[PDB]
């Protein structure tokens, strides 16, 4: 029963410091691009769309333009993890990660920006 | 650029009646069922779980299940129909329908249950 879990759901960050969101995974294998769907949102704003071994600049919104990327790194050890860079104030809320490889699970991290 | 697009995305239906909400999607030639994934849910309840081809009717939540259905003549088409049948209170909500098929992309309908 494919599952994602997240290590942290809330995270309690600082104005312009740095952070690292993280979706968990199973890739009990060699990770296969053929099989991935990864994708990042928070309040309707899309911010990561890997499709494939596919990722497309074009539909990411405004604000993460250029503050935002996914660590291809952890991807291959099963960990999704979204790094946003100068944490804003409208940064704070609900960040959904949505994945597909084999199965299809997601899940929801809280964060909180402190002035 | 794979998307899901909604018909209706609110329903006002009678207690008691019949509905059929849908979810369409792109299906250039013929479905192929093992790369595909249908996800339905109400307010993280578990309706329709259908894995490439299987329906797991394991944890799926037992009110719906009940008189929850997918139609799956109705995928060949690319329409994702979920049946309920016998609308009850508790299925008023906001339902999302998640579908992987090539790419990925969900939608959200709003259901209102009027009792006369
Ligand atoms: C998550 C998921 C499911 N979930 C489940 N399936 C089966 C059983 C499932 C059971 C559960 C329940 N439990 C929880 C714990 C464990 O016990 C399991 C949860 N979840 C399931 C099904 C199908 C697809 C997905 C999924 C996966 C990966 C990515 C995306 C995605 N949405 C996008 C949305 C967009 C939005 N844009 C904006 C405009 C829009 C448009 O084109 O209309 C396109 C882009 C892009 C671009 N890439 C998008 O990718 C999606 C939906």
Redesign the interface.
């Known amino acids: 029963?494919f599952t994602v879990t997240v290590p942290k759901d809330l995270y309690v960050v600082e104005y312009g410091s740095n952070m690292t969101i993280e979706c968990k995974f199973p890739v009990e294998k060699q990770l296969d691009l053929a099989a991935l769907?990864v994708?990042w949102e928070m309040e309707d704003k899309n911010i990561i769309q890997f499709?494939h071994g596919e990722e497309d600049l074009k539909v990411q919104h405004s604000s993460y333009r250029q503050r935002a990327r996914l660590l291809k790194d952890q991807l291959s050890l099963g960990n999704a993890a979204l790094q946003i860079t100068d944490v804003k104030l409208q940064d704070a809320g609900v960040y959904r990660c949505?994945i597909?490889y084999g199965?299809?699970d997601?899940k929801r991290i809280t964060v909180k920006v402190n002035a």
């Open positions: 029963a769907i994708y499709v949505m597909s199965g299809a997601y």
